[PDB]
Amino acid sequence: GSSGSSGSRDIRFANHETLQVIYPYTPQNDDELELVPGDFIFMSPMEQTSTSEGWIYGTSLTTGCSGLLPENYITKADECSTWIFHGSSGPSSG
Numbered sequence: 001g002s003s004g005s006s007g008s009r010d011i012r013f014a015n016h017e018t019l020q021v022i023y024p025y026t027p028q029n030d031d032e033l034e035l036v037p038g039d040f041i042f043m044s045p046m047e048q049t050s051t052s053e054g055w056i057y058g059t060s061l062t063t064g065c066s067g068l069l070p071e072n073y074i075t076k077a078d079e080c081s082t083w084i085f086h087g088s089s090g091p092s093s094g
Contacts, residue, residue, distance in 0.1 A: 006046075017043040018077035019058065025073045033060065033067025041074050 018040055025035035041058035049057050050068060059066035
């Protein structure tokens with residue numbers, strides 16, 4: 001069949017989200033992950049743990065480590081743009 005587990009080293013056929021760190025954060029355990037200003041964080045629903053509360057499970061782009069972080073330290077990725085994908089536009093939407 002196909003040689004490739006569910007996950008992958010790179011996001012090609014996955015719907016992983018991308019967020020940019022807006023402020024640093026000093027963790028205290030593994031459960032959480034270190035945050036760095038100017039880095040990205042890949043969030044996945046299959047890796048969500050204690051997020052619904054306020055945190056968010058993702059993976060760093062610089063280091064490559066994953067863990068829980070405060071949603072109040074990151075932001076949506078508005079740097080990457082699609083090629084044809086429209087999504088939605090009109091009422092102050094973009």
